[PDB]
Structures are given as C-alpha cells and as structure tokens.
Amino acid sequence: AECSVDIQGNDQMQFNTNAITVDKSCKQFTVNLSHPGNLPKNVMGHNWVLSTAADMQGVVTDGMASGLDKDYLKPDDSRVIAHTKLIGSGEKDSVTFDVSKLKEGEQYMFFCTPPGHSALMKGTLTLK
C-alpha cells in the first residue's frame, strides 16, 4: 500500500526505478524485490541496500569484497540501514525497516552491492 514499493532487478543490471519516495508519516516501509530474467544468483544476483549518500561508497567497497556467500555485504555493517537478501532470477525477497531510522532533509541512496552492479544500479530514497 502507501508504505511499500516494488522494485525489479533484471539480467542487464538495471533497477526499474532510480528514485523512491517514502511518505514521512509511514511508521515502517517495505521494499519488495524481484528479479525478471533467467540468470542464476551466482552470476546475476541482486540485492537492495539502503544507506546515507555519504556511507554508500564504503558499504559498496566492503560489500563487493565480501563474496557471494555473504550476499556481498560486510557482516554487521552498521552503515547499512536496511537490506534485502541477495536474489537470483525468479526469486523474490522483501525488507521492512523503521521510517524513524530516517531524517527529513537527509540524502539517502539505495543500490545493489554485487561486483560490477553499484554504479549501474542505484537511486535516491527521500522522505516527503
């Protein structure tokens, strides 16, 4: 409903949006991730990861170093506000997070941390 969004990551390393708006009055927000295409998780897995704009570079750097078996996220990374699991084609995953983790006026970025994906698969998340 109002406090959720569906996003897709395809075989061409594209998310189907580059901007998410979250109603600032939502208590929680949910992202429903899916993966059109046929490529398996070990070739073209995608996740959806949320951080401040400022933290994205470090999250990406350490995440893509962490390997497939760690969903390309540094374990226990405090900079990651929320994240789905890593999914392959035909799979689905949702994450819910607390909209109080988030500041009106702050610059948020969502992105996909697997090797080669982050520059091609990112966008803004903003409260309205």
Q: Where on the chain is the footprint of Cu ion (CB under 5 A)?
A: 46, 112, 117, 121
Q: Per the annotation, does 121 bind a ligand?
A: yes
Alpha-carbon distances, residue 4 vs 12, 89, 104 (angstroms): 24, 21, 18
3 is in an annotated binding site: no
The nearer residue to Cu ion, 81 or 86, going by C-beta atoms, is 86
Q: Which residues pair with 8 in a beta bridge?
A: 34
Least spacing, CB of residue 37 vs Cu ion, in Å: 11
**Is residue 64 marked as binding?**
no
In the complex, least distance from residue 40 CB atom to Cu ion, rounded to whole angstroms: 13
We find the least distance from the C-beta atom of residue 3 to Cu ion, in angstroms, to be 24
Was 117 annotated as part of a binding site? Answer: yes
Alpha-carbon separation of residue 41 from 22, 27, 36, 71, 112 (angstroms): 29, 32, 12, 10, 13
Cα angle 15, 29, 117; round to 5 = 25
Residues annotated within a binding site: 46, 112, 117, 121
**Binding-site annotation: residue ranges for Cu cation:** 46, 112, 117, 121
